[PDB]
Amino acid sequence: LHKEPATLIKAIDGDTVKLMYKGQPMTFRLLLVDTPETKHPKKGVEKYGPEASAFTKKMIENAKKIEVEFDKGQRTDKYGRGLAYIYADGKMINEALVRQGLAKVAYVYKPNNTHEQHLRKSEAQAKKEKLNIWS
């Protein structure tokens, strides 16, 4: 896997951000994490949704460098979103959300599971520490 540079356009939710990639505007879905969402009337503004969403926003908004890392399987989902690991100044936003108890480790589909063990480890910590979603 290699990282590639990208530029923020707009954060949309805990798990979704709009980036400029290879010169094209693209919506990205964070690989392997499910956050509470502020989207879906089939739901609404679930609990810790506003929190997960401000976490992703701040982190991506305040960064020097954003990088996207595609996994080894399909790179877009059925809605046309890029599927990736997103890094803000070297820190993976997907792991940070899970480390802070603001995301669950999603249902994993091979072969898009390269960082799955890593994230599960952080998730177990977040649970142990009873943070947010786990409290």
Tokens representing 88? Answer: 């803000």
Known binding residue 15? Answer is yes
Q: Is 29 a catalytic residue?
A: yes
CA distance 23 to 56: 22
Known binding residue 77? Answer is no
Sequence-ordered list of residues with C-beta below 8 angstroms from that of 121, at least 6 positions apart, any chain = none
Q: Considering just the CA atoms, what is the radius of gyration of the chain in Å?
A: 14
Q: From the candidates 29, 67, 95, 123, which is the catalytic residue?
A: 29
Q: Is 81 a catalytic residue?
A: yes
Known binding residue 35? Answer is yes
Q: From the candidates 51, 81, 95, 123, which is the catalytic residue?
A: 81
* Residues that constitute the known binding site for Ca(2+): 15, 34-35
Q: Which residues are catalytic?
A: 29, 37, 81
